[PDB]
Design a protein around this nucleic acid. Structure first.
Lengths: 150, 116, 44
RNA sequence: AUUCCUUGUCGGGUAAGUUCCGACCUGCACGAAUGGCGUAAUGAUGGCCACGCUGUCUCCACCCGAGACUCAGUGAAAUUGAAAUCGCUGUGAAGAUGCAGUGUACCCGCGGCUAGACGGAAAGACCCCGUGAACCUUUACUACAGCUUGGCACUGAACAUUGACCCUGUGUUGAUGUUCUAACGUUGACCCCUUAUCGGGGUUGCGGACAGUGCCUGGUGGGUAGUUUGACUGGGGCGG
RNA sequence: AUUAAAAACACAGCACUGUGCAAAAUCGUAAGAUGACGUAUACGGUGUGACGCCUGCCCGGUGCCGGAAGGUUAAUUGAU
RNA sequence: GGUGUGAAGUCAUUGAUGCCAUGCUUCCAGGAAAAGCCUCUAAGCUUCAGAUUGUAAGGAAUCGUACCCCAAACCGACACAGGUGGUCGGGUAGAGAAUACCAAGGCGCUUGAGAGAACUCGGGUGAAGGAACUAGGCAAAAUGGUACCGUAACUUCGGG
RNA sequence: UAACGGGGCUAAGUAGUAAACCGAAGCUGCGGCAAUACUAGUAUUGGGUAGGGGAGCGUUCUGUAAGCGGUUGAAGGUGUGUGGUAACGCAUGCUGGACGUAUCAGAAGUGCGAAUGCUGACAUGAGUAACGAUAAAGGGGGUGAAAAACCUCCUCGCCGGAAGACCAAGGGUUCCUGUCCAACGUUAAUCGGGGCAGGGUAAGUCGACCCCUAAGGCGAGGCCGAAAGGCGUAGUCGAU
RNA sequence: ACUCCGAAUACCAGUAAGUACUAUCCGGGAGACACACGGCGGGUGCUAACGUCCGUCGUGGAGAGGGAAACAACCCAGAC
RNA sequence: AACCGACUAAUGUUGAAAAAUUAGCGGAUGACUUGUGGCUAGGGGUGAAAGGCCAAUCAAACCUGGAGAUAGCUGGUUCU
RNA sequence: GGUUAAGUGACUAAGCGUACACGGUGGAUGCCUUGGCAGUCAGAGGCGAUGAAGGACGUAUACUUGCGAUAAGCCCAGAUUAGGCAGUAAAAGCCACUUGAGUCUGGGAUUUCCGAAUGGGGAAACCCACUUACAUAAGUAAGUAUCCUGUUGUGAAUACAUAGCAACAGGAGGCGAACCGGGGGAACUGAAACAUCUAAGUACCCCGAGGAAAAGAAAUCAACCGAGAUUCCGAAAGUAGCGGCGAGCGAAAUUGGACUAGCCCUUAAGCUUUACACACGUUAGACGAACGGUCUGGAAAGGCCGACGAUACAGGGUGAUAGUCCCGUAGUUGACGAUGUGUGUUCAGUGAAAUCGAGUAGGGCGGGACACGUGAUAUCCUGUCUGAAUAUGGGGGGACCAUCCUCCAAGGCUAAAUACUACUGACUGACCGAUAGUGAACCAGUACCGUGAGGGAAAGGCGAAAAGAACCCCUGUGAGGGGAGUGAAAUAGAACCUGAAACCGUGUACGUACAAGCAGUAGGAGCAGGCUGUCCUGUGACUGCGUACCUUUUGUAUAAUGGGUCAGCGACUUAUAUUCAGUGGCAAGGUUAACCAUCUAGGGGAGCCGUAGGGAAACCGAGUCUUAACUGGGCGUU
């Protein structure tokens, strides 16, 4: 904090509580006793623990009937309106759509949709599998996820 | 994240202050004095819940002694009498009877005398 | 009673004035310092 | 202005004098430029005495003013755990408004007083402690500056004496002394840059391998600096 | 300066001592300064403190000055 | 308010700390500097340029200038009983710039009004006594001018 | 008083005998909670500082959450009722006027009565002390909402080697005029060195500038110095 | 600070009943190392001290409740 | 007398005033006093010497930085 | 019935208490934020004699912003288009409306004085000159610093010459938060004292850069196998060592990466310039989808109903909360000119020291640096004194010697990977939200304090909109208020959101003037309100009991400490490593680090831990150590 070099007043005589700096954390306008500095909140996850979690999640999706395997899932134009329709055929509004590779069209068609993400097998995360209400996987992507997760 | 203490800080202070309603001066207005006051009130209240049981029994015994002696027997002899007569009426009841049904008290006294 | 501040302008200038500060290295250090601090008044 | 014992003793002064003056000398513990003893004059100097003078005092009285008091206007302060804030005797972290027992006591101001609130003020200056601090001292420790010593360098030449060594008297080195000039010095003179008591260059004189400086080295070194200087302890020190 | 004005400091006078001038001494790493545009009747340090009468004994200690013979002794040298 | 118009306007005496005087006398501690200024020449220029004396014509810029200054305007945090260099200094009395009373001029100090206790402050007087006070005559009281008279020890011969 | 706690006591003392009773948070009874063992019941256990161990409450922030609640009233504030062993929760009237946020996780600037703590506000002392030289006022009139304090007149008093008049410094518009009186002015104020607006400072001769230099400063080159710089010549500044 | 003798207690060990989560070992975390009074045995002191130093037990510390007028440390007794 | 000073007393001590006022007091042609401007600076200056003074500060100024020195000490340390 | 007597006894409140109601003060809280804080990705990494930073004074029909006597501007070119003439801040006088209104960007012009400040001087923002031109009057303009380097002239003491002097040209000077190299260089502190040592080559001072700097191409390592400059990052490793062997300090070999580049003294690569090209980007910008009705309300973005866009649901604004109202966003486009970049192709330089390294290597003495403190101390630097060899040679390989290996010093240049961000842009946040966040959200490095260096604040919020209260009334043509009016709201009225507490009032109920103390507590009458009296609320006569809290202590009512009160803030954190425990994964295995990466994935096996111990060690090894050897014994085995 700015300033605070000078001793505010003499140690003895004034009748005041001893001070050494106007920027004591006791004083208004003073330091924070334990001022924060920028942190790295990253945690190690073991590679097996990540894969184990991912397998556990996919299994639970299956049992909860949230994993929806489709033969394919493609959008013809980069049009949101088309994707909404396709989703309505699958009778799902909120869904993660995991394909083997994300087409521009499907990526573009999904941007403006909330609670609809288009993700490649590479890009699937532990939270996203949990977060979206359904997970629509193409059968190719299933086989790719299998190899990815062991 | 930074936490401001205001809203909760006030609620604690207010709780104590509300318990100190009726105390004189600072003791109902000022948290530092009220807190001390509400604590000592709790301490007294604990001590007195015990000592209530002593005070009331002393009162009964004093009343029973009055009534027994009006009926010509000491408290000490009357309790012995009743014990010997196997009468297990508590001092709280006896003292109630001595006030509200003087005749019954006299009966009990006569029973007590017979046992002695 | 004679107090410590017995101002003369000339003595103020010759001691604390701009041309006095600018004459010495350490004076220039002061002017630069004050100019960095944002001080409206660099000299007396 | 020194004397412990001590108000020494004697004399003076006073009715009465631990002070004063004179003197004595068993000077605890005067003493001759840290001067000794005198000494006119001087001193907002210390002590003592006297006259005058007086409210200094016996022993205060009265009076004149400025406050204090009252009214109107303005309007602080230190302090403050909270107070429904008595006496006494006792008790008790050992000196009680607050505990016990008891005595006394209608409620509230104003003018006064200061006995208590261990009243207010300033985290006791005393004392101790801290392996605290500072500054001061020295024949504390360790350093350093400065001073100084020698070696080497800048630094040379002739001789003369002499030492060692070398050979066969001879060289090679080392001192020592004299002499010399060419390094070096010059805070002598003159010339020029140049209108210049700086400086530089030139010339010359006087010095001269000296001085002086660098590196190394012994000494000296409270001049300066950093520090250390135990603990127990019927406070602490001293002693142990 | 603001609890001490004095018997404390200074003082003229006195004495010791350093200092031959690029003076000693002091400031400064140095250059350069003061000393002094002075030159021992001067300058510096130390003490004493007008004036009068005086100022005794001790050179073991510690200074300082002088002496160098010997002893001890650094760098250096480098015999064995 | 404005303008208008206006008498006498001398003499003597006294007399500065002002002036002559940056003098004079004397002393030792031995008393700025530099320029303006006068003069002299040098190099240099010699119908010149310059110099002198005169006569016309023109110029002389720029900045300050209010106000306070024994202070309510400066320095003291205050509209603060303090501090702040220099100049001027009338009358009577007086040696005097002391002091008293006044002049010129300036002020009544930015809370008032009552009352007339204790006690505090600053003063006045005091019977009898007179330092008995007190650490101590602290404080008070006292003395206090001029002229003349007169004046001890002591003394370094000045003093005292 | 003050050596029974007091009253008072000749037993209300002392010793004893008999049979009673009072008396604690002890024991029991009744209801409830918890710890630990065992097999929901038993059994035991539950004073507590330093300290160890265990379990929670609430706060801000992230996800959950573009969900959920909200101008048909969020947060906050203030009452009331109610629930739990507690931290606290829930509901709700009034106020308020736009946010809030379940649940489960996650992360902390996560909880204040103390530190002669820090900042702000507001108390107490208290309508108390004091209102700044004891040079001094009195009255008539005026203006004004109002006059002890401003204007004016007549008196009085005070300074007069100053409490007058100037100048330098220093300050900086305080000067003059009109207007205003909130704050400022230790009261009031019509007044003011206050606020606001306008005006006001006229130079060949005063002063500055300027020429000149003192102490001294700076200082081309220079000399010296790790660097920065120091010193200093020629110069150039510098008034008192 | 003598012993021809010599207890009670205490301690060491064994055997045995009953009661008790005791003892021990290895780890994580401490705190504390100013103690006080009372009884008993003593030193010191005056067989003084609300003295001082030990041993040992109790209480206080860290303990409320009742008694001892009031009274940490005494008597009774351990507060979900 | 001015001026410079500061010996005594009283007042004052939340002052009129962070050193004054009042009454007295000393020096008052000198080692005097005063204005303006210069110079000396922190282990440094300056000192007729009091450790005095160097901006109401001095046995080592003030400011900023090292710097959150260190503090075996004191205080304080927040819900159930 | 009266009188008397005795007993008994309400009704007082000067004031005070408690409770409640309504206020005041005050500014907490909540909500909000035009400001901060920390970053990421880019940019640009300098500005200045062509006069900076920063200022002074001016400038339009006080201050801030802009500008500079051409003074909120002038010009020019692009771009843009209905309003504009800066703000406070209204007025006023005006201009303009499809393009000379204006705005935006760029480039020109102008650019007082001060400031390196440079003609000289100087108290910064002032004063005074010389030269040369001009003017004729007593003016105007331009030029005029110092140093360094070079080149020309001149040109002393002595001939020559040199010094000196002058002219000319080209540089430089100052400022800036950090990063960088170098010259100097503390102390507190730690070592539980202190001196070696530490702190620390840190802080600080100085000098010099640059967009980076530095370093760099083996007289290097290694180990008989080999590697191949430098820099940075991960390991090896808190290992070897160093060390009052204390406190502490701390490598390398080797290995995983990032990046890679070498080139010349017979003259190179690179760098800089110069132009010519070309590419290539930047620099004003433009277009930019889709919503109605109804309900609540002051207002609709909310609700209800039904639509519609989405390569656009980033974000902001609009009278509450908006995909569809607005500004934007996605996407698509835009540069005359000016810039930047990268390529060639040129130029003119530089590199550059010339020519392979002698006062050098090595040595002695003194120091210093290397993790290494002089130690047995290799190596490096050098103040001083010395001093080779010179490929048949020399350096190193941790005393030293031999052998062997490896390298070639005494000349140079060299990108990238690396460091930093005062400044510009965009974006992000389990960062702050007005006592916080910057000292500074506000006219803040201001006010204020100080001689000065320097120190250094407080201070946000009416409303959707000022609609900021016409007019009337009291009052001093006041202050302040009451009406009226405005507004959804005026206890939103400018002393303005919310509006806590301390603290102060008014009103009402009850208590209280014979009564002794931590002010309560257990009990309890009476009175007053409700509700309807084995209720609730308020008060509380009277009785019992009862000496605050904190701290510190053997022990505190203590007359020991601290606190006037309230509100706000104020103290076990963070990083890294070691260890123990819980939990999870995997399991005789577990795990990756830097880094790479289409980036929480996946790669990456360097390394670490476990899997064997014993011994000082070599070494041995389910054993080993001890000893001549153990009947043994220590530790281990399981």
């Amino acid at each position: 904090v700015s300033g605070g070099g000078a001793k505010p007043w003499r140690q003895k005589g004034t009748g005041r509580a001893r001070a050494g700096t106007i920027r004591s954390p006791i004083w208004r306008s003073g330091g924070v006793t334990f001022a924060a500095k920028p942190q790295d909140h990253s945690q190690k996850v073991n590679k097996k623990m990540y894969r184990g979690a991912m397998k556990s999640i996919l299994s639970e999706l299956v049992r909860q009937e949230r994993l929806i395997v489709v033969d394919n899932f493609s959008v013809e134009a980069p049009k949101t309106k088309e994707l909404v329709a396709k989703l309505k055929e699958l009778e799902l509004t909120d869904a993660l759509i995991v394909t083997s590779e994300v087409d521009e069209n499907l990526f573009l068609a999904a941007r403006n949709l909330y609670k609809v993400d288009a993700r490649d097998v590479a890009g699937i995360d532990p939270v996203s599998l949990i977060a979206f209400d359904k997970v629509v996987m193409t059968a190719e992507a299933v086989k790719q996820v299998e190899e990815m997760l062991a | 994240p930074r936490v401001k203490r205001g809203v909760q800080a006030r609620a604690r202070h207010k709780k104590v202050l509300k318990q100190a309603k009726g105390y004189y001066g600072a003791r109902s207005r000022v948290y530092r004095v009220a807190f001390q006051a509400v604590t000592k009130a709790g301490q007294y209240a604990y001590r007195d819940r015990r000592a209530k049981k002593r005070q009331f029994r002393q009162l009964w015994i004093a009343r029973i002694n009055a009534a027994s002696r009006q009926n010509g027997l000491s408290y000490s002899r009357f309790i012995n009498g009743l014990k010997k007569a196997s009468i297990e009426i508590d001092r709280k009841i006896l003292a109630d009877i001595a006030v509200f049904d003087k005749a019954a008290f006299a009966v009990l006294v006569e029973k007590a005398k017979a046992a002695l | 009673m004679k107090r410590t501040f017995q101002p003369t302008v000339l003595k103020r200038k010759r001691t604390h004035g701009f041309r006095a500060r600018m004459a010495t290295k350490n004076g220039r250090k002061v002017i630069n310092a004050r100019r960095a601090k944002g001080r409206a008044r660099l000299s007396k």
